[PDB]
Design a protein around this ligand. Sequence first.
Ligand SMILES: [Ca+2]
Length: 765
Amino acid sequence: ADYASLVDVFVGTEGDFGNDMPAAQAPNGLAKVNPRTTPGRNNTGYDYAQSKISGFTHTNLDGVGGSGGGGDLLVVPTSGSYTARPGTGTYAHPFSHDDEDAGPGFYSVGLGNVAGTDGAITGAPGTIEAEVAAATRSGVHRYAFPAGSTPSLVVDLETNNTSRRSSSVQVETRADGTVELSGQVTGYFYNAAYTLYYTARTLQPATVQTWGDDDRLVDATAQDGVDTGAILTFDPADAGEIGLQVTLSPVSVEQARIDQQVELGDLSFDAIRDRTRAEWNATLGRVAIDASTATDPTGELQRLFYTHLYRMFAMPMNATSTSGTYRGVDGAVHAAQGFTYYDSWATWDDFRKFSVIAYIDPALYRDMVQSLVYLFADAEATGTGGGLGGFVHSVPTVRWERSSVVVADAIAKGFDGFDRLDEAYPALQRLVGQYSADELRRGYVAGNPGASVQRGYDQYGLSVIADELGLTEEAETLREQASWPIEKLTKPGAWTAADGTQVGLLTPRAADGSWQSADHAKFEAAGLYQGTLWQYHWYDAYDMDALVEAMGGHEAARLGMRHMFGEHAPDDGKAMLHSNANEIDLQAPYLFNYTGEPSLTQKWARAIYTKETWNRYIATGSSSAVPSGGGEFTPPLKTKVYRLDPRGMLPTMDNDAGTMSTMFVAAAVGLFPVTAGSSQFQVGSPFFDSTTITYDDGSAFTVTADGVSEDAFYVQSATLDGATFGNTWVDYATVVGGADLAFRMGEQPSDWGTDTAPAFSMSTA
Ligand SMILES: [Ca+2]
């Protein structure tokens, strides 16, 4: 019943080992009440390895790179006093993980008391007990200050994980003496600025001073600039209980006030915390697991599952008001009619995650795709022709590449009635871009194999959308162009197998058709972003059949796949050409199903996600967190990719809006989307004796793995709804239809699935 207790919100919160947050948050919540460590932090604002905390920020992004996004609206409890804008060093409180507790919807910590005046503020006797919880749009605070303290909360509106652009604060003192603060914060992350409106009320009487960009702390009730803030001071008689409620809205301050009355009403802190815990239990309860001692002797694998299921329901965030409105990239308010509008995208990294969301929470997935459609429809509506990067966004956000694939994913899966798809389409076309004249002639971008394979997948996705809109002729042209990267950039005999077999591989190609020299295993060679040619080779996952042919046939592919995973040298870390640390070749472990060796897919799926593997590659050039260089672990390292630890992922391995977590869930269920933008899932190695996904109507998908253990991870035989099943892929319809997929597991590889009906490929469909 209480799945929330199995989630460990600290997994991935250390250093550069995931960039996730312990923040109090509701499922897909906008409000993310994250403690802030000092002087070090991860991208979210909390590094587990630290021992001081300043306060709580209310906005954020999960698992992103750079210096993180959001981090707006810092609330810092203190017994100190100020006569000017606070020095940030004065916020610092000792904390200990021994006096810290968190889980779905809540975070609590005992902070060492601090007192004094301005720069003289330092440690003081006693403890500030801090508790926060979250609803969808709101963060609530309860503080206990030592007896005799003059409690104060600093509301710092400059704090941002990357860049504060503008902020404002208006103060109101009501009849009962409580204070309400409101205004806007405008930040920036990666491509775009974003604005959020806020309202924050105290629950006890307070007096207040504000500051603006001149650093003067004054009695004025309004500020508007870049660095602004407010300092709330309470009566010592209220030291036992200081409460604060903060609500966010992409729409307006007054909308935030309405949202707050709707969301929180007169509910107590405990009831708001309790209600969000129940909401998490309902969300997590969509997947019910029975895991024997044999497969999970310590219970950590089940905790790991639920922790990553928790992480899967974070982004995109609910960007809709309680009144059913949202703010568009045109800067105006619009109705999200009959659906919830979500926003905050990092689709270049995360596109495969949506395909998995589709089979865990179909209704949420539908709303997300509809939202993605409205977002592009809105860009088109401006009439400006500009890219999404040129607008101010409704929530912190990242990037939008591969959106065409995600939309196509819902269409291929039989979702329809997507309002405003006709409007979204031309904006999706501009996103994807066109080959230049010279590029059209030759069939590829000169010296840029990465951009070529990427457009190929984008064009496949657009082609699905084109056919749905009845643009048949456009769809044909798109499919033709989408075939080009495979045909034109797979260089024959790029790699020669041990027995002489000639294997073709993605290789940069000059304008005149000459092949360009390249080490196919070198990180970021040939203009590639965050990967190698071997890793990008497999990118055009919508046409494995054409890829197998371009590679030089079945045997060439089969031997290539074996070499990709160093099968000929299992104890040599350097022979590992696959990367676990980035999303570029996420699907690669499941490609053995395509080379007639499904047992190897099963092995690698179970190994990468639940065992120690060889790791040659990190996700970036180098990292101070592990001896590394040139995009590699130096030397290669045998280690678990996923740990139930604050050091949750490999060093440099960012979750990226819950992508790595979502892939873990998919591996655990045993169904992986090699082809996002299709309706198919590839069979892996289900982790648990029984896994049940219950849909909103009470029907359920049940996948069983009879006799599964840490050693018994190979499929021996299978049935589908009682009947012999021999395919290594299943359709989305079969899953959400409530099928019974039953596997028989064993400790040795079998030939199960080696006579599979072919999986989807654009060229053979
Ligand atoms: Ca990444």
